[PDB]
């Protein structure tokens, strides 16, 4: 199947704190495997998955030394951004970054990524061609022009097509699973009415769809749900409910769609 690696990086300035806090999280296939945090006693990249422990000291020392450069890079960029937007001192500001690569089932590069957000909103991003930049804000054109004259896109294209891909292969090999949902329906009175709640439990990954049908067509209005949420053990949960006349429990059918199933599940309230 397809694979991916991601690095999510954050720099936070606060009202008085003197210098920003820097956090970098690495993901392989949308699961965390390394983390760096400038708040820690001895700030370093630390393994966050058991399969990462097989890397030796000079791997972690090289990653950590890069995270210290990033920390400075974000500090200077937070300072420049303050002036681009004519923001005064004494506020809280955030800088964010997502970078990484997507691989197909053949382990070849599908797409690279490099995006930035200031104050949680899109600031500048590398286009799919890995050659040109998109920057919407007027304050962001200053950065787009600097990065075009310096040719920064070439540096990131080389990283995304080379190191991002090859180190992901190494991570994939060393770490080379989905959990299918278990579903059930519950019964709750509403005098003269009843709600049926279709549960989905223990599934991984998080993407899932729950539908209800009235002996035929889907129910889009009338459908109460919750956003998919982590159980805390690595799996996820979700439910969807509909209000139903008390004698019509069996004219309603829950469907569960998940990438780990042979086919969608089909289930009703069974007393």
């Amino acid at each position: 199947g397809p694979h991916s690696m991601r690095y999510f990086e954050t720099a936070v300035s606060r009202p008085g704190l003197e210098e920003p806090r820097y956090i970098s999280v690495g993901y392989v296939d949308n699961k965390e495997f390394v983390r760096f945090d400038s708040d820690a006693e001895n700030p370093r990249y630390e393994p966050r998955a058991p399969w990462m422990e097989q890397e030796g000291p000079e791997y972690w020392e090289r990653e950590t030394q890069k995270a210290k450069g990033q920390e400075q890079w974000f500090r200077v960029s937070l300072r420049n951004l303050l002036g681009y937007y004519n923001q005064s001192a004494g506020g809280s500001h955030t800088l964010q970054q997502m970078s990484g690569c997507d691989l197909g089932s053949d382990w070849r590069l599908l797409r690279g990524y490099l995006q930035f957000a200031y104050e949680g909103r899109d600031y500048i991003a590398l286009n799919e061609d890995l050659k040109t930049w998109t920057a919407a804000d007027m304050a962001a054109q200053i950065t787009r022009r600097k990065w075009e004259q310096s040719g920064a896109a070439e540096h990131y294209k080389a990283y995304l097509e080379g190191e991002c891909v090859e180190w992901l292969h190494r991570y994939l090999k060393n770490g080379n699973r989905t959990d299918s949902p278990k579903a059930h329906v519950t019964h709750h009175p509403r005098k003269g009415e009843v709600t049926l709640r279709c549960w989905a439990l223990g599934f991984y990954p998080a993407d899932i769809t729950l539908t209800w049908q009235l002996n035929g067509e889907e129910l889009t209005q009338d459908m109460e749900l919750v956003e998919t949420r982590p159980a805390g053990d690595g799996t996820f949960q979700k439910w969807a409910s509909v209000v139903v006349p008390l004698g019509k429990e069996q004219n309603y059918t829950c469907r569960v769609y998940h990438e780990g199933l042979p086919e969608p599940l089909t289930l009703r309230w069974e007393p």
């Binding site: 890069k66 990033q70 420049n80 930035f116 990131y156 990283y159």
Partner: peptide, 9 residues
């Protein structure tokens, strides 16, 4: 393998 930024914003 984490990235290394070049020019600052």
């Amino acid at each position: 393998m984490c990235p290394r930024m070049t020019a600052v914003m």
